[PDB]
Structures are given as structure tokens and as C-alpha cells.
Design a protein around this ligand. Structure first.
Ligand code: NA
Ligand code: NA
Lengths: 249, 249
């Protein structure tokens, strides 16, 4: 059976003081049957590693929120896979909705980043999802197919991939996603991955839910047959992120 | 008379070990009449601060290679001015040629970033410059005017601004800029700032040269009347960056 994956995307948040307090809480988490990652900002990755230190259970690992399309060189403002590996970071998000929406990350850029990450041995959390206009006009499945076809173009091996479904339509719009709707989207993603690859590959692929996750709804969502964990937003900046990890046990 | 400014842009380069060695050299620099900044990647800022420690000569300060357009929040992959201030970083590059060229930073995004940086108390190194096609078609001045007009739109106070002129036409093209050509571009920039503001403001504004700078040419360039220091690329990842600082004495 698939090992569950619980990620905490800090986004553009954190201070030295707030992260010190938060990581002190996370060090109290004694064990997990799931993979557990937190994704601080690039500015905070080394600090967060220092805060964890060695006096912890080895439940939490650290990931990046983004990776450069290129390796080292004349890429002002960018951070490369090789730099991350030097820092002992073995995972990154790619194609988060916010980067697609705000920073001109196209499907083709996302493909480039997935390939770059996987080639450098990183675990890549590929983010996909449709907007409210797309959902309301019946294009959910068209969008998921396009995003997968393009993001995974010439990507042969999914062993180090995880897919996060972001119900963009249900984030900040006043519209709310039910667990049933989440499950339906995850089942469809898995079904398309079967077509693009095969049933063995799709059966092994973790598909994590990247909508609104809190301590109040995580236990219901994780039971859904095609939901294999979470990519958590704001709830990952609170000690009760531990309750979300516990739901995945 | 203007205080000179020597910046070292590391771009997307560095490892823990290589930076440890480099900063150990930079700590040997005993004094400078110039402002001195190094701009590591965001991943490396806290480690570079560690390596300098708390008993060095106080010659070097640390800057960022980029800042977010927005403050904290749901901006995956971005690092904000407020985050930089929390880490005691007081300076950033904005509008570097590589970000304009590769990451879709328009003049309007650059304006947004200059305003956001300055409003948060950061010293902003605004980068401008024209391409080889622009230079060869006679558009150098048109391009500089446009870039300044847009980047400084509604920017009233230039006390925390520095401008870096990047002769993009002379970087990676096989075409080489002479110090005379650099001087001519710097003089034009200052002349246009006079028109946009006034001669007091333009006489106080540092305009630093962001073309090819090494220990072999820095002494000739710094003597130029309108060249007030440097934004150095690859030469800033070597101990001999110290020789470039020394040219600005
Ligand atoms: Na499940
Ligand atoms: Na000069």
C-alpha cells in the first residue's frame, strides 16, 4: 500500500522567532508512518535545519518551495537543485498554483523543473489544479489531462514524484470543496496516470490533497480511497500541524 | 562627494564549503572608504552571516539578489522585504538583467519592487541597461530613458537608491565595452536623472558599473567621472574581489 505523504508549505511566512517556536513544537512529534516534510522559504531552510538540530525523532524532513530551471551560473535570484543537495535538501515543490498564477510558470516551465529535479535525485511534488471558471464550464478533466500531459512529458520514472491536487476553484473564491469532490478529482488524476503510464505506476503514485486542510477535516479527507496525504497551507505554521500528521497514521 | 559602492553579486553559485573559504578571505579585509556588499543566494544568506560572525572588521554587508513584489502571505517561492529585515539584511538588487530576460520582470514589476523595497527601508540597487540589438540600432538613450521613467515612477526619494548600469550588449555577445563607453552611458544616466529630478539629486546618486569587472580593469573604470563603484559578477566569488574593493579607496 502507498506510504502516505504529509507536507507543510509555509509559503512566504516566518520569522526567526516564530519558526524557532514552531520547530520546538514539531520536535515533540514522536513518530509517523507517513513521510513528513515542511517547506520553509529558501531564506529559512538552513535556520530551520539548525532549529531541528539532532535532538529529534527523524519524523520531519525539509523541502524547497521551488527550484531553478537551470543549474548553477548566471541566474540572479535563483536557487538550483545542486545547491539544495549541498544543503541536504532532497525534495521540492514544482508548479504551485501561486507560481503559475503570479510568476508566469507555464506547463512547459513546470515540465522543465520536474525533469531537472528528478534528474538531480530530488523528490518532486508536482502541483496541478483547475480554476473556478474552468470547473464551472466543465473543463476540470480537460485541464488535469493537459497539465499532466505537459508536466510529465518525457518523464519516464515516477518513483520520486508525488502529485498534489490544488482545487484552485475552492481557494479564496467563496466556493468550498467537499471530501467527495476531492476524491473524485484524485480518482480522475489516478485514472489518467494509468492511461499515460500503466496501472502499476498509478497504483504506486501518491496523490496528495492541496486544498484547505485543518485539524477539523483531515481525518475525513485521508480516508478517501485516492487521497494519500496532504500539501497543507496555513495550518502548517501552527503546532496543530501535528494533528494533521496524526490523521495519516 | 559620493561614497563609492562595491557590490559582489554571487548569482546562482556557492556551496557551504566554498563560501566558508571565501568569507574567511573577505574577513581579512581590514577597512574600506566604500560601501561593500555581497549578494549571496537566499539559501545562503544566514550561513554567510554565520561565517562572518560577530567580530569582523565591519567592511562587508549582506544584500539580497531579489525581493518579492508583495509582503508575507500566499506567495510560494518568494521572500519578502519584511523577512529580509528580520534577518538583518538591508539591501537588495532589483531588476537584474537576468531576471528581466529569464523570469519575465517587466519595467512595471521593477517599479513595484523598487517602491516596495524603499518603503520597507531597504537600500535598492536598481539595474538597467540595453541589449546589443538596442545599442546597434541607436536606441541606447531611448531604452535608458524608458527604463528610468518606468522604474522610478512615483519614487520621490532617491536617498536609499543606487543604479547599476549593465551593458547587456557587452555581456556574452563577443562585443566588449571600453571604459569610455561605460563613462558615456553613466553620464547619460545622470543627465536624465537631473531631468527627472534635479541636479542636487543626480549629483548625490551613486551609479555603479555592472559590466565585466576584474582586478585587471577596476582601477581604470573607477576613475571615470560618473562611475561610482561596481556591481561585480564572477570576480566576486574569488578572494581577489578584495583588489576591486581596494580600487574604490
Ligand atoms: Na486515503
Ligand atoms: Na569615479
Amino acid at each position: 500500500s502507498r506510504k502516505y505523504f504529509v507536507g507543510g508549505n509555509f509559503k512566504c511566512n516566518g520569522t526567526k522567532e516564530s519558526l524557532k517556536t514552531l520547530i520546538d513544537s514539531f520536535k515533540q512529534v514522536e513518530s509517523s508512518n507517513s513521510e513528513v516534510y515542511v517547506f520553509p522559504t529558501s531564506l529559512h531552510i538552513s535556520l530551520v535545519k539548525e532549529f531541528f538540530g539532532n535532538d529529534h525523532p527523524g519524523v520531519f524532513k525539509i523541502g524547497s518551495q521551488n527550484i531553478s530551471c537551470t543549474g548553477n551560473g548566471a541566474f540572479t535570484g535563483e536557487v538550483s537543485c545542486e545547491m539544495l543537495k549541498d544543503m541536504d535538501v532532497d525534495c521540492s515543490l514544482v508548479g504551485h498554483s501561486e507560481r503559475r498564477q503570479y510568476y508566469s510558470e507555464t506547463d512547459q516551465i513546470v515540465n522543465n523543473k520536474v525533469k531537472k529535479g528528478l534528474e538531480n535525485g530530488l523528490k518532486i511534488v508536482l502541483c496541478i489544479g483547475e480554476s473556478l471558471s474552468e470547473r464551472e464550464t466543465g473543463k476540470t478533466n480537460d485541464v488535469i489531462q493537459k497539465q499532466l500531459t505537459e508536466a510529465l512529458k518525457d518523464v519516464s520514472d515516477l518513483s520520486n514524484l508525488v502529485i498534489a491536487y490544488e482545487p484552485i476553484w475552492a481557494i479564496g473564491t467563496g466556493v468550498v470543496a467537499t471530501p467527495g469532490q476531492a476524491q473524485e478529482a484524485h480518482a480522475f488524476i489516478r485514472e489518467y496516470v494509468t492511461r499515460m503510464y500503466n496501472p502499476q505506476v498509478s497504483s504506486n503514485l501518491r496523490i496528495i490533497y492541496g486544498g484547505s486542510v485543518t485539524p477539523d477535516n483531515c481525518n475525513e479527507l485521508i480516508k478517501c480511497a485516492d487521497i494519500d496525504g496532504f500539501l497543507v497551507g496555513g495550518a502548517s505554521l501552527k503546532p496543530t500541524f501535528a494533528k494533521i500528521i496524526e490523521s495519516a497514521q
